[PDB]
């Protein structure tokens, strides 16, 4: 009856709300209109989503994703209307707004995403009222998986972390220094590659130098992004796998910088379902 | 007459030496064999160097450049041989070895380059004996023009430096944030773009936040790169426009970190002239 989606770098999460039930665990590839053509997006829904659905008939669709800024929402709406039989309404907005709806519902707060990339905004309870452009894995995106990966690879290859952790990393991911350079400078989606090797931090978090890398990265995200908003007045909510799997260090960073922490959740899907059952039910 | 050259990402510096005199000072574009075919290098030499010479006869050529690793030495040497009339010797090596010969001559030393990129090595008096791979403008290249540019843009756009400096930057270079994202992530030579806007720091160095940016970047270069070497035994030499035009801050970084600076020079040409005169 209702279809909801949150689209990230790696995957899109789809949920169906129908007759008081939730059907989750429906995944496709990411669906970012800055990186995919309308025919690529259409091909992807047709081939990978529709087979997982009993029907393509829906009352409403609420699609959220990276790249679904104003300029791109008509494109995405178009793709969806061509694949799905939607009787009422198709909403398209950003992953950030999904994170806000999930974590804050209908009330105000500071909302942050910490996954492959990172992002932060002020949500007024209805819409994003302010935001800090992340700037990508090179210039910004502090605390993201990609930046964590960027920091780690720099530390290991420059021998900042000793021989053992370096060789353990290269052996684990079957990388040479030459391969890493190739992938970072000369292949598509280097941010994805870097994020993909960042779990090495969580696995080795016991090492003081690893713990420190993560702590400093997070402090950097908070001071450069979150502290731009009225943080002494509003809780900051965090959504994403980086936020979640390094939750202890994120709280440590917040205590050290002076930020009131709120929700820390792995993904916004549970919160979005709450949104569409409770608050958004009425409209 | 002998011809000496030091080639980086921006320029190739050439000197003609004859009878104890420097007979010409000539610039062409950079010639990196990883970024140019042998053909393209030949054309650039013929079109831009040769018109600036009054003969193409040299006893020796000594060409130093980024990318001129052993793998590429035959390719570069062949282009030079096909463009010039050299009687005795064509030597081809790295910009790093040029910095070493210039700053150290025949004595050991720690040698660093701080230009568009950065690099650090130990020179044993004859050849480079050890080095720290720079890792490029994303992963490494601490203290480089590219990285200074990267730090600046982040700081300005994320409002860490005030509104005035941000507006001044965007106005000066006729840039929007959209343009910047485009140039950094989706256009060729993003490191060159970043390095190309880095002079804004030198132009605004009296601003505390600007000075702070540069000091911290230099500290990071020293701790991550130079300190890998036997720096209490050898003084560290610095070659490059970034090392030169931020000399005072580099010395401050060095004193803060316990590194003993030697030579700080804009480029190795002076030193290379001394080298070939002994
Ligand atoms: N168990 C785990 N331990 C450590 N890191 C993990 C992890 N599971 C995932 N990650 C890391 O989290 C990052 C991606 O998390 P997430 O799935 O939230 O990103 P995403 O790309 O879908 C959101 P966006 O694109 O909006 O930033 C990657 O860096 C990944 O390696
Ligand atoms: N007067 C000046 N003040 C500050 N920065 C300067 C400068 N002149 C050049 N730069 C910057 O220095 C960087 C390059 O340094 P340099 O001039 O040594 O060239 P390079 O590193 O490409 C070696 P080569 O000269 O052989 O090409 C660029 O970011 C450039 O804009
Ligand atoms: Mg120059």
Author numbering:
A (entry chain A): 1 to 283
B (entry chain B): 1 to 278
Original paper wording:
Unlike other bacteria, the pathogenic Tannerella forsythia, a member of the red complex group of bacteria associated with the late stages of periodontitis, lacks biosynthetic pathways for MurNAc production and therefore obtains MurNAc from the environment. Sugar kinases play a crucial role in the MurNAc recycling process, activating the sugar molecules by phosphorylation. MurK and K1058 are two sugar kinases of the cell wall recycling system of T. forsythia, sharing a sequence identity of 44% and separated by a single PGN-scavenging operon within the genome. Structural and sequence data showed that MurK and K1058 both belong to the group of ribonuclease H-like kinases and are members of the ASKHA (acetate and sugar kinase/hsc70/actin) superfamily.
We successfully cocrystallised MurK with AMP-PCP (termed MurK/AMP-PCP) and established its structure at 2.12 Å resolution. Crystals of MurK/AMP-PCP were monoclinic and contain a biological dimer in the ASU. The AMP-PCP is clearly bound in both protomers of the ASU of the monoclinic crystals. AMP-PCP is bound at the N-terminal domain via a conserved DxGxT motif with interactions of the side chain of S9 upstream of the conserved T10 residue, both forming hydrogen bonds to the β-phosphate group. T116, also conserved in the homologs, is located on the opposite site of the phosphate entity and forms a hydrogen bond with the β-phosphate of AMP-PCP and the γ-phosphate to the backbone amino group of G117. The adenosine is bound mainly via van der Waals interactions contributed by nonpolar residues but forms hydrogen bonds via the carbonyl atom of A195 towards the hydroxy group at C2 atom of ribose and a water-mediated hydrogen bond via S198 to the adenosine ring system. In addition, the aromatic ring system is aligned coplanar to tightly pack against side chain Y244. Finally, S241, part of a conserved IGSV sequence (residues 238–241), stabilizes the α-phosphate by hydrogen bonding. Only minor rearrangements for ATP binding were observed, with an Cα-RMSD value of 0.78 Å, aligning all residues of the N-terminal domain of MurKapo and MurK in its AMP-PCP–bound state. This is in agreement with the observation that ATP is predominantly held in place by residues of the C-terminal domain.
